[PDB]
């Protein structure tokens, strides 16, 4: 009874391409869903997101090339062309946006949503945080001296040898000082502000870049730095240097992360239907999620600062001025634009806190959410190929936008999201806490395929479970309004709508990765390892197991001990 | 089969008693060993065994001098109200003490000086032993203090709010304490959250277990002057004589910037327990007593010697076989680390033979019974030992605890193996199982993630990896945990196998009462016995998540499971929840 | 419990090599008994049966004893000692000596044991059992077989033989024709010869002829005769349509064939083996009179086999008739009764000396077994050496033998639990025993005459049919098997086992308990061990290609397919490993073909 609207045929090709019929649709759900997408592709990590992200970046190079007559654009253009080819630490941070010894950035204070308090957190290294220090892995330990001596002789003699083992050692001594992520899961503790007279050249340090109360997220690592203290300079060089080992991509990507505004304004304006199309989808989920104390979070949602698309402060006047602190003329640019990006975010400190800010370019794809202020952010880039394009079977746009929305939204109600109120502040909920153990335990009863653990990521794990499990209900409702959009996609007449919805959702996640980066990924992120993700989060949603009616016993349907919820 | 000497048939009795039989061993072996015992008796077969030698002690105690010292102290405690009359209102001097060390609710210095005082350290847990590097003199170790709660002060659910629990106990105490007025309330609750707070922090500072293994980096040789830029007073607190001593502080912790008090209290509430106190504090005294108790000592010496040397030989051979990753360099490395391994049995060589000498070394005690005062005395005393040998030469042999205590330990840096149901002359199952596996757990403990520290060897660390990831598959009720244990854990299924494999090459009659079980599978059983430990379910985490060791059920099933041989002695088709090579 | 006695350790050591307890024994079996063996033993630089294992063992022991008043034993010893090793010249001489084509062909066959175009050597007739009689029959040809180009491999090799010959000059292309000649000659021979399965109507292949057209005496070339019997009116006609130019391409063939024979002309085996093939009673006489031990073999079997038979036989008119048959069977154990020495020499009295050595043997074996013609017919002999490992049953004598050879490797040993031996020797023996009641043997009768031993023949075909179903639906791993051409000996073992098993059972019911768990794998009764054994014997892995190669050509099935089929057809075993129903080794569903 299928449909043959050509727009659906285009979206059909994508899903079908990765879908595999060889394997059954119950056992290793993830496997069946995208075994193809594994076995098709060439050779770091590579995955559906990286797929889209690519697509859109190609597109932006395109339009970039096309129109070359706002000065902002003009900048990004010339850039792209050019690319195709105590006090100490601070000063460097300023000029480089390369961090050491302290990571520093600014945003709304957590006590009150008015002054922009200074957050000084412990820094993130090129390699993972707690990968160094275990009676364990023997990785790369020289690669430092390796890459140093490389460019070293090009600069041109053996100080290198010691200097290496020394600097590495400074690292090792810095790492175990940090905090694992197991417990950057509590803001009750990081927040403990000090003034500008409490530091006892930190005054000078900042003077590299205030009278305001200053906040140290980590007082155990900050106090350890005082016991640490000349040769350290080497170290920083290392890192600074260490920054710098088709180029179409890596170029435009650098752009993305550094001219995080022009890119978006030059892509989204190269549009009134899209914003309105997702406007209802965002309002559909939220309320459905709601319908299930209660009053507070109820408010929170009803006050959450939604923001579709991209900033509204994107004629030209604003886009000009906001970035006007640029001047870039004819790859020293790399420096130039590194010193403008980090300064543009640090200059906001002086100004009063806002509720509309935009935490990153509207160019790439992940609906980032700041519990900090209170904000979803679904940058326009995302709402696209296979998450949602303007005319696909509602099956998708729910499984796409609707999803990553919901997965985001729910953050306001996880491990962290609880301890913030819509202001952006703090203060039977134990019941929920129970569930935590539940998931992380049941989850931990499952593994990865190459290790085989995941007790840190219950954050994003539950974020998924909820977001989707809700969203789906939302779609169910939506169609309960009408009852016909069930026109099943052409070129695949063996799944029902609901089936599809899942199939899509799965496909959203696939990836084929070298084992090395897999095991590193495992301990370097707030993520399940994707296969674990898909399979597990579907071990839980009942409605899924239903639509597939995979009878008992088959290894995806143990309702006996049921599936914890939120 | 089935001889009928006295102690023989009695051995048969013990193995027969707590056993269950209507539970198949190739299904649930955990409760099999002692199932009836769990439903009849109401804890371990150790506090059992411990109790036992303890009784034996008092049985010598009915009547030289060191004995007199003990017996008197024993009295001090066992004078019943000397456990009551003082703690009734000895707060009189608790004031003396406490206020001698500060104020109160509503008034770094003392920080450690409590050591010499009551050895209830806080904020500098410290002691001396061999300089880990330049092994000819001991020096110091000034490290983080173990916290009254286990590691878990976090948003970590398993404790996250249950922290409040402690508060209340604490809070409770205060009021019960605050009952006393010598020289209403609100403010306390604030004090609660302060103490708990500095707890969460001091933990945060500190170092959880799993990483506390790289002695490769736990070694920060510091001399007084980096401290002079963090103190020197503090150590001067621990003076009874000298500064050339080269301390080495392991754990860079956030030096600092009311609570210590909050702790001391928490330590200040028929007889055995007192003897236990002694055993942790007056090691060699009560020990020498134990020696004096039993003769036949020499024969035990003979035997347990032959036994232990036999086993360590076998283990060396195992090394010779397991050469799938290691090699010459590695091998004779091992060979060495073995044949340096020095050995103690029952007693050090300063205990007995001029039958007085201990009373010379232990000559740091007395009082007339003209207690809590004496308590403070004996506590401070144990410490008086733990340091005094700061001055003297590095001794490669030292019972770092009483012989009474019933365990085995490989003080690795001295490289010392040392030992105290105690092996009464039985069919070989017992004698070769109890002291066998003990020889085991020790002997392995000089080759795991610890041992390797006094190349391809990476492969080893992989072997470990394999064991670690096993357990968390199997555990008893929230599962058990992993990486915690690879130190104490993988010991067993190395050292056991080492041992067992002696038994055969040492070879023999079925037992009486029952005989159905031939020797070998018995050996298995009796080993299993040496852990039969009834426990509740709530203390189970308390001994799961806190300690380095790991609880029984794992430590029986997940032991066998990982040794084939136990295949070939139970009639079981290898394909069920029962039946990583380790060496 | 375990009879700690060493030899029992030795028996457990041979049962340990290939134990593979990792895989459940109730799931699959053949894995659980040989997978080790497949694994440890890398393929010796094809098929390496436990048999050929034995073969090495015995044949070695032979060699060991040889080296050392002594007549034939001396003959052999010399013969072998001439093995450590040009002489193509000799062959060339033979051909030259030849080059009335028939009589030529005759003498070639004769003094070179090379059969071509008429594979003939005599025995008793069937229809009149005292009268020796000749036979003439379709030859036996290298490939056994359509689809294949393996034909062209035969080609390549043929031309390459005559090439390597072309080394000697005492025309460098024409060979590349003579090749195709002899090939398509193969093709004719085959494409008229008879494929196998149809080789059972002994009713048919009997038509007699005495003194068709194109013939020359040709019997001369082998050395009032009886009626030469010709087993393929089809074939031995087809020569007649296939005959001064003829000589050129027809003799072309017999050469290349005869040549291809011996191209190649511790390895000592190779030649010793050959010797056993050709002077068989000789090397046999060695083996026994070099191992000499009778008690342990003149009885245990002659205890076993008697037990077995009696049991199986006893588990209308038929039952009796058949009984009288078995009761009648002449049953020759270890070895015959021509074995002090002289008379051994006396039959074997046709050799002496200081490829010539090989040529003296070839013609001596072609005459040896064919020299009985002049004498009276007998029921009392072997087919082959008492030094092989096999067991054969030429119903034409209703003779069941057991070459003493096998009885040492894992088919028999003296000091072993009655289990092992009731699964080794016991089996292959009971296998034999029945092997004369399937549709090969059943056509005969207590003398060797023919009316029909058997109507219940129905029930017989009822067995056969369903079994072929089961097989052609239980396909070996590496692509399937044949039917009938496999039932041929399948049905045999399928029965013989159940016989032997019952035998064990009743035996041990005749001697109390005795069940002494066996001392290296202590965790069984004997029974399980009995299975484990019969399983064992056939433990062999084979060349993946040669797997299918000998899949077709082997009369009887791949190892695995057997061992883990025959079992599936036994309720008893089904018990013995206290398994659950509705598993991979249970025909509640695909019902067992209860053969008896």
PDB file of C-alpha atoms in Angstrom, chain C residues 324-517:
ATOM      1  CA  UNK C 324      22.962 -72.713  10.651  1.00  0.00           C
ATOM      2  CA  UNK C 325      24.891 -70.333   8.433  1.00  0.00           C
ATOM      3  CA  UNK C 326      26.638 -68.447  11.202  1.00  0.00           C
ATOM      4  CA  UNK C 327      27.081 -71.574  13.235  1.00  0.00           C
ATOM      5  CA  UNK C 328      28.697 -72.893  10.100  1.00  0.00           C
ATOM      6  CA  UNK C 329      30.988 -69.939   9.334  1.00  0.00           C
ATOM      7  CA  UNK C 330      34.636 -70.789   9.062  1.00  0.00           C
ATOM      8  CA  UNK C 331      36.387 -68.369  11.285  1.00  0.00           C
ATOM      9  CA  UNK C 332      40.089 -67.843  11.052  1.00  0.00           C
ATOM     10  CA  UNK C 333      41.649 -65.830  13.810  1.00  0.00           C
ATOM     11  CA  UNK C 334      45.066 -64.338  13.990  1.00  0.00           C
ATOM     12  CA  UNK C 335      46.211 -66.349  11.051  1.00  0.00           C
ATOM     13  CA  UNK C 336      45.837 -69.635   9.206  1.00  0.00           C
ATOM     14  CA  UNK C 337      47.220 -73.058  10.076  1.00  0.00           C
ATOM     15  CA  UNK C 338      50.110 -73.497   7.727  1.00  0.00           C
ATOM     16  CA  UNK C 339      52.352 -72.135  10.444  1.00  0.00           C
ATOM     17  CA  UNK C 340      58.589 -74.628  13.137  1.00  0.00           C
ATOM     18  CA  UNK C 341      58.647 -73.549   9.496  1.00  0.00           C
ATOM     19  CA  UNK C 342      59.109 -75.740   6.478  1.00  0.00           C
ATOM     20  CA  UNK C 343      55.688 -75.757   4.935  1.00  0.00           C
ATOM     21  CA  UNK C 344      55.444 -72.012   5.104  1.00  0.00           C
ATOM     22  CA  UNK C 345      58.494 -72.112   2.868  1.00  0.00           C
ATOM     23  CA  UNK C 346      56.883 -74.788   0.830  1.00  0.00           C
ATOM     24  CA  UNK C 347      53.854 -72.913  -0.391  1.00  0.00           C
ATOM     25  CA  UNK C 348      56.019 -69.886  -0.554  1.00  0.00           C
ATOM     26  CA  UNK C 349      58.592 -71.866  -2.435  1.00  0.00           C
ATOM     27  CA  UNK C 350      58.912 -69.803  -5.570  1.00  0.00           C
ATOM     28  CA  UNK C 351      61.669 -67.229  -4.940  1.00  0.00           C
ATOM     29  CA  UNK C 352      65.434 -66.886  -4.444  1.00  0.00           C
ATOM     30  CA  UNK C 353      68.258 -64.491  -5.375  1.00  0.00           C
ATOM     31  CA  UNK C 354      71.703 -63.254  -4.327  1.00  0.00           C
ATOM     32  CA  UNK C 355      63.162 -53.077 -10.240  1.00  0.00           C
ATOM     33  CA  UNK C 356      64.269 -56.724 -10.880  1.00  0.00           C
ATOM     34  CA  UNK C 357      63.571 -57.609  -7.191  1.00  0.00           C
ATOM     35  CA  UNK C 358      60.097 -55.917  -7.515  1.00  0.00           C
ATOM     36  CA  UNK C 359      59.410 -57.749 -10.882  1.00  0.00           C
ATOM     37  CA  UNK C 360      60.204 -61.174  -9.250  1.00  0.00           C
ATOM     38  CA  UNK C 361      57.484 -60.398  -6.598  1.00  0.00           C
ATOM     39  CA  UNK C 362      54.774 -58.917  -8.947  1.00  0.00           C
ATOM     40  CA  UNK C 363      54.632 -62.170 -11.023  1.00  0.00           C
ATOM     41  CA  UNK C 364      54.979 -64.333  -7.860  1.00  0.00           C
ATOM     42  CA  UNK C 365      51.797 -62.826  -6.289  1.00  0.00           C
ATOM     43  CA  UNK C 366      49.797 -63.097  -9.593  1.00  0.00           C
ATOM     44  CA  UNK C 367      50.606 -66.890  -9.588  1.00  0.00           C
ATOM     45  CA  UNK C 368      50.654 -67.530  -5.754  1.00  0.00           C
ATOM     46  CA  UNK C 369      46.840 -67.050  -5.141  1.00  0.00           C
ATOM     47  CA  UNK C 370      45.973 -68.234  -8.734  1.00  0.00           C
ATOM     48  CA  UNK C 371      47.953 -71.575  -8.383  1.00  0.00           C
ATOM     49  CA  UNK C 372      45.055 -73.217  -6.359  1.00  0.00           C
ATOM     50  CA  UNK C 373      43.167 -73.810  -9.707  1.00  0.00           C
ATOM     51  CA  UNK C 374      45.154 -77.093 -10.336  1.00  0.00           C
ATOM     52  CA  UNK C 375      44.322 -78.285  -6.730  1.00  0.00           C
ATOM     53  CA  UNK C 376      40.838 -78.964  -5.157  1.00  0.00           C
ATOM     54  CA  UNK C 377      38.525 -76.066  -4.023  1.00  0.00           C
ATOM     55  CA  UNK C 378      38.780 -74.902  -0.338  1.00  0.00           C
ATOM     56  CA  UNK C 379      36.767 -72.870   2.283  1.00  0.00           C
ATOM     57  CA  UNK C 380      39.895 -72.254   4.409  1.00  0.00           C
ATOM     58  CA  UNK C 381      42.329 -69.502   3.509  1.00  0.00           C
ATOM     59  CA  UNK C 382      42.703 -65.775   3.723  1.00  0.00           C
ATOM     60  CA  UNK C 383      41.969 -63.139   1.226  1.00  0.00           C
ATOM     61  CA  UNK C 384      44.965 -61.066   2.278  1.00  0.00           C
ATOM     62  CA  UNK C 385      47.968 -60.896   4.566  1.00  0.00           C
ATOM     63  CA  UNK C 386      47.697 -61.616   8.230  1.00  0.00           C
ATOM     64  CA  UNK C 387      49.697 -58.485   8.557  1.00  0.00           C
ATOM     65  CA  UNK C 388      47.388 -55.827   7.285  1.00  0.00           C
ATOM     66  CA  UNK C 389      44.802 -54.211   9.384  1.00  0.00           C
ATOM     67  CA  UNK C 390      41.261 -54.928   8.238  1.00  0.00           C
ATOM     68  CA  UNK C 391      38.706 -57.607   8.520  1.00  0.00           C
ATOM     69  CA  UNK C 392      37.143 -59.108   5.448  1.00  0.00           C
ATOM     70  CA  UNK C 393      34.473 -61.583   4.689  1.00  0.00           C
ATOM     71  CA  UNK C 394      34.497 -63.266   1.353  1.00  0.00           C
ATOM     72  CA  UNK C 395      31.128 -64.962   1.445  1.00  0.00           C
ATOM     73  CA  UNK C 396      32.355 -67.024  -1.485  1.00  0.00           C
ATOM     74  CA  UNK C 397      33.990 -68.987   1.278  1.00  0.00           C
ATOM     75  CA  UNK C 398      31.765 -67.808   4.111  1.00  0.00           C
ATOM     76  CA  UNK C 399      35.059 -67.031   5.770  1.00  0.00           C
ATOM     77  CA  UNK C 400      35.452 -64.489   8.535  1.00  0.00           C
ATOM     78  CA  UNK C 401      38.985 -63.679   9.518  1.00  0.00           C
ATOM     79  CA  UNK C 402      40.813 -61.243  11.712  1.00  0.00           C
ATOM     80  CA  UNK C 403      44.374 -60.502  10.724  1.00  0.00           C
ATOM     81  CA  UNK C 404      46.448 -60.811  13.850  1.00  0.00           C
ATOM     82  CA  UNK C 405      47.855 -57.424  12.929  1.00  0.00           C
ATOM     83  CA  UNK C 406      45.026 -55.208  14.078  1.00  0.00           C
ATOM     84  CA  UNK C 407      44.721 -56.798  17.444  1.00  0.00           C
ATOM     85  CA  UNK C 408      47.422 -54.608  18.943  1.00  0.00           C
ATOM     86  CA  UNK C 409      46.501 -51.074  18.090  1.00  0.00           C
ATOM     87  CA  UNK C 410      43.338 -49.575  19.523  1.00  0.00           C
ATOM     88  CA  UNK C 411      41.197 -52.379  18.381  1.00  0.00           C
ATOM     89  CA  UNK C 412      42.681 -54.809  20.806  1.00  0.00           C
ATOM     90  CA  UNK C 413      45.185 -55.207  23.577  1.00  0.00           C
ATOM     91  CA  UNK C 414      45.482 -57.993  26.059  1.00  0.00           C
ATOM     92  CA  UNK C 415      45.616 -56.321  29.440  1.00  0.00           C
ATOM     93  CA  UNK C 416      42.937 -53.747  28.876  1.00  0.00           C
ATOM     94  CA  UNK C 417      39.443 -53.435  30.300  1.00  0.00           C
ATOM     95  CA  UNK C 418      36.951 -55.596  28.527  1.00  0.00           C
ATOM     96  CA  UNK C 419      35.483 -52.321  27.359  1.00  0.00           C
ATOM     97  CA  UNK C 420      38.186 -51.278  24.972  1.00  0.00           C
ATOM     98  CA  UNK C 421      38.480 -54.659  23.418  1.00  0.00           C
ATOM     99  CA  UNK C 422      34.777 -55.098  23.095  1.00  0.00           C
ATOM    100  CA  UNK C 423      34.785 -51.854  21.155  1.00  0.00           C
ATOM    101  CA  UNK C 424      37.823 -52.495  19.075  1.00  0.00           C
ATOM    102  CA  UNK C 425      38.241 -56.062  17.930  1.00  0.00           C
ATOM    103  CA  UNK C 426      34.768 -56.819  19.142  1.00  0.00           C
ATOM    104  CA  UNK C 427      33.314 -54.192  16.877  1.00  0.00           C
ATOM    105  CA  UNK C 428      35.149 -54.695  13.655  1.00  0.00           C
ATOM    106  CA  UNK C 429      34.525 -58.373  14.130  1.00  0.00           C
ATOM    107  CA  UNK C 430      30.804 -58.014  14.649  1.00  0.00           C
ATOM    108  CA  UNK C 431      30.825 -55.579  11.790  1.00  0.00           C
ATOM    109  CA  UNK C 432      32.186 -58.368   9.651  1.00  0.00           C
ATOM    110  CA  UNK C 433      29.778 -60.861  11.058  1.00  0.00           C
ATOM    111  CA  UNK C 434      26.805 -58.898   9.933  1.00  0.00           C
ATOM    112  CA  UNK C 435      28.507 -57.713   6.811  1.00  0.00           C
ATOM    113  CA  UNK C 436      27.566 -61.057   5.374  1.00  0.00           C
ATOM    114  CA  UNK C 437      23.854 -60.470   5.941  1.00  0.00           C
ATOM    115  CA  UNK C 438      23.284 -57.204   4.136  1.00  0.00           C
ATOM    116  CA  UNK C 439      22.301 -57.412   0.500  1.00  0.00           C
ATOM    117  CA  UNK C 440      25.786 -58.518  -0.325  1.00  0.00           C
ATOM    118  CA  UNK C 441      26.032 -61.546   1.896  1.00  0.00           C
ATOM    119  CA  UNK C 442      22.356 -62.367   2.143  1.00  0.00           C
ATOM    120  CA  UNK C 443      22.454 -63.642  -1.388  1.00  0.00           C
ATOM    121  CA  UNK C 444      24.621 -66.521  -0.252  1.00  0.00           C
ATOM    122  CA  UNK C 445      24.246 -69.592   1.873  1.00  0.00           C
ATOM    123  CA  UNK C 446      26.098 -71.793   4.261  1.00  0.00           C
ATOM    124  CA  UNK C 447      28.245 -73.239   1.530  1.00  0.00           C
ATOM    125  CA  UNK C 448      28.578 -70.349  -0.861  1.00  0.00           C
ATOM    126  CA  UNK C 449      25.951 -71.606  -3.255  1.00  0.00           C
ATOM    127  CA  UNK C 450      22.948 -69.504  -4.210  1.00  0.00           C
ATOM    128  CA  UNK C 451      19.244 -69.855  -3.885  1.00  0.00           C
ATOM    129  CA  UNK C 452      18.747 -67.026  -1.383  1.00  0.00           C
ATOM    130  CA  UNK C 453      19.474 -67.136   2.364  1.00  0.00           C
ATOM    131  CA  UNK C 454      16.248 -65.262   2.775  1.00  0.00           C
ATOM    132  CA  UNK C 455       9.389 -62.586   2.436  1.00  0.00           C
ATOM    133  CA  UNK C 456      11.214 -60.857   5.238  1.00  0.00           C
ATOM    134  CA  UNK C 457      13.321 -59.395   2.472  1.00  0.00           C
ATOM    135  CA  UNK C 458      10.673 -56.714   2.745  1.00  0.00           C
ATOM    136  CA  UNK C 459      11.676 -55.745   6.244  1.00  0.00           C
ATOM    137  CA  UNK C 460      15.197 -55.814   5.001  1.00  0.00           C
ATOM    138  CA  UNK C 461      14.521 -53.224   2.336  1.00  0.00           C
ATOM    139  CA  UNK C 462      12.599 -51.320   4.965  1.00  0.00           C
ATOM    140  CA  UNK C 463      15.820 -50.894   6.855  1.00  0.00           C
ATOM    141  CA  UNK C 464      17.904 -49.988   3.844  1.00  0.00           C
ATOM    142  CA  UNK C 465      15.572 -47.354   2.461  1.00  0.00           C
ATOM    143  CA  UNK C 466      15.170 -45.332   5.598  1.00  0.00           C
ATOM    144  CA  UNK C 467      18.861 -45.496   6.339  1.00  0.00           C
ATOM    145  CA  UNK C 468      19.732 -44.013   2.975  1.00  0.00           C
ATOM    146  CA  UNK C 469      17.277 -41.261   3.752  1.00  0.00           C
ATOM    147  CA  UNK C 470      18.912 -40.521   7.062  1.00  0.00           C
ATOM    148  CA  UNK C 471      22.318 -40.335   5.449  1.00  0.00           C
ATOM    149  CA  UNK C 472      21.533 -38.192   2.444  1.00  0.00           C
ATOM    150  CA  UNK C 473      19.972 -35.937   4.996  1.00  0.00           C
ATOM    151  CA  UNK C 474      22.905 -36.056   7.459  1.00  0.00           C
ATOM    152  CA  UNK C 475      25.698 -34.600   5.415  1.00  0.00           C
ATOM    153  CA  UNK C 476      29.279 -34.458   6.580  1.00  0.00           C
ATOM    154  CA  UNK C 477      30.723 -31.009   7.121  1.00  0.00           C
ATOM    155  CA  UNK C 478      32.794 -30.802   4.004  1.00  0.00           C
ATOM    156  CA  UNK C 479      28.839 -31.205  -0.848  1.00  0.00           C
ATOM    157  CA  UNK C 480      27.184 -34.344   0.588  1.00  0.00           C
ATOM    158  CA  UNK C 481      27.281 -38.132   0.485  1.00  0.00           C
ATOM    159  CA  UNK C 482      25.866 -40.912  -1.688  1.00  0.00           C
ATOM    160  CA  UNK C 483      23.117 -43.291  -0.795  1.00  0.00           C
ATOM    161  CA  UNK C 484      23.327 -46.980  -1.611  1.00  0.00           C
ATOM    162  CA  UNK C 485      27.011 -46.944  -2.379  1.00  0.00           C
ATOM    163  CA  UNK C 486      27.290 -45.949   1.289  1.00  0.00           C
ATOM    164  CA  UNK C 487      24.645 -48.086   2.958  1.00  0.00           C
ATOM    165  CA  UNK C 488      26.778 -50.846   1.475  1.00  0.00           C
ATOM    166  CA  UNK C 489      28.947 -51.043   4.565  1.00  0.00           C
ATOM    167  CA  UNK C 490      27.056 -48.600   6.723  1.00  0.00           C
ATOM    168  CA  UNK C 491      24.254 -51.038   7.390  1.00  0.00           C
ATOM    169  CA  UNK C 492      26.938 -53.391   8.457  1.00  0.00           C
ATOM    170  CA  UNK C 493      28.492 -51.293  11.158  1.00  0.00           C
ATOM    171  CA  UNK C 494      25.156 -49.928  12.175  1.00  0.00           C
ATOM    172  CA  UNK C 495      24.285 -53.454  13.132  1.00  0.00           C
ATOM    173  CA  UNK C 496      27.577 -54.877  14.244  1.00  0.00           C
ATOM    174  CA  UNK C 497      27.849 -52.222  16.893  1.00  0.00           C
ATOM    175  CA  UNK C 498      24.545 -53.028  18.558  1.00  0.00           C
ATOM    176  CA  UNK C 499      25.705 -56.594  18.478  1.00  0.00           C
ATOM    177  CA  UNK C 500      28.950 -55.792  20.232  1.00  0.00           C
ATOM    178  CA  UNK C 501      27.282 -53.542  22.721  1.00  0.00           C
ATOM    179  CA  UNK C 502      24.786 -56.164  23.727  1.00  0.00           C
ATOM    180  CA  UNK C 503      27.733 -58.481  23.961  1.00  0.00           C
ATOM    181  CA  UNK C 504      29.514 -56.246  26.403  1.00  0.00           C
ATOM    182  CA  UNK C 505      26.374 -55.862  28.396  1.00  0.00           C
ATOM    183  CA  UNK C 506      25.618 -59.515  28.766  1.00  0.00           C
ATOM    184  CA  UNK C 507      29.265 -60.303  29.341  1.00  0.00           C
ATOM    185  CA  UNK C 508      29.533 -57.936  32.240  1.00  0.00           C
ATOM    186  CA  UNK C 509      26.249 -59.359  33.420  1.00  0.00           C
ATOM    187  CA  UNK C 510      28.164 -62.639  33.520  1.00  0.00           C
ATOM    188  CA  UNK C 511      30.970 -61.415  35.714  1.00  0.00           C
ATOM    189  CA  UNK C 512      29.505 -59.367  38.494  1.00  0.00           C
ATOM    190  CA  UNK C 513      30.502 -55.714  38.301  1.00  0.00           C
ATOM    191  CA  UNK C 514      34.195 -55.256  37.417  1.00  0.00           C
ATOM    192  CA  UNK C 515      33.455 -51.717  36.284  1.00  0.00           C
ATOM    193  CA  UNK C 516      36.834 -50.203  37.075  1.00  0.00           C
ATOM    194  CA  UNK C 517      36.862 -46.501  36.144  1.00  0.00           C
TER     195      UNK C 517
END
